[PDB]
Amino acid sequence: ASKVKQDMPPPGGYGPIDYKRNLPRRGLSGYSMFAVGIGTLLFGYWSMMKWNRERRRLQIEDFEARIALMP
Amino acid sequence: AGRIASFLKNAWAKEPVLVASFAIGGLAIILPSLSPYTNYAIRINRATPYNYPVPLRDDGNMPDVPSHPQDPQGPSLEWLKNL
Numbered sequence: 269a270s271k272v273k274q275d276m277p278p279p280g281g282y283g284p285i286d287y288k289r290n291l292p293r294r295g296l297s298g299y300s301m302f303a304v305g306i307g308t309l310l311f312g313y314w315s316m317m318k319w320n321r322e323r324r325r326l327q328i329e330d331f332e333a334r335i336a337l338m339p
Numbered sequence: 340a341g342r343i344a345s346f347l348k349n350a351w352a353k354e355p356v357l358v359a360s361f362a363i364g365g366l367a368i369i370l371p372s373l374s375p376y377t378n379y380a381i382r383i384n385r386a387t388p389y390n391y392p393v394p395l396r397d398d399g400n401m402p403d404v405p406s407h408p409q410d411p412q413g414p415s416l417e418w419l420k421n422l
């Protein structure tokens with residue numbers, strides 16, 4: 269006298285299944301991104317200004333060596 | 340005062356690339372004429388000795404011309420090293 273055994277859902281019910289779109293925001297603000305970009309640009313401009321002025325002085329020294337040697 | 344603001348808002352909403360390019364070009368046009376360093380660059384370009392400095396014949400009444408490179412007369416580049 270065996271009872272009916274059959275593939276059925278468990279008692280009560282199966283756990284809820286997610287189906288809605290899940291796309292998080294995941295970012296900074298536009299103002300912050302622009303501000304970081306301009307800050308990086310200004311730091312680069314200042315560094316390049318110093319280095320190019322030093323390069324100009326070094327080139328002047330190199331040219332003076334040639335002027336001394338030319339005669 | 341009020342038309343230009345609405346136009347700028349609309350342009351920033353629809354064509355930010357054009358607003359950015361026009362702003363950058365305008366700054367590039369305007370700022371050099373308001374800078375104190377623009378003269379300095381010219382002076383630097385004038386201090387670079389590409390060719391030989393040919394000596395002058397001392398006629399006896401040339402006070403400001405040096406007789407030796409290390410003499411105090413003549414142009415100075417002290418402003419450049421401190422820059």
Ligand SMILES: CCCCCCCC/C=C\CCCCCCCC(=O)O[C@H](COC(=O)CCCCCCC/C=C/CCCCCCCC)COP(=O)(O)OCCN
Nearest residue numbers: 347349350353354357358359360361362363364365366368
């Ligand atoms: C003072 C210096 C000036 C020169 C420097 C700039 C260098 C080069 C930049 C310009 C290069 C050529 C620009 C070509 C212009 C394009 C004109 C055009 O066709 O515009 C329309 C669109 O209309 C526009 O022109 C866009 C807005 C108007 C111009 C952009 C803004 C103008 C100036 C804004 C910045 C001003 C300064 C910033 C102020 C900051 C706020 C205080 C194109 O869109 P469609 O192809 O038709 O789209 C179809 C698909 N939907």
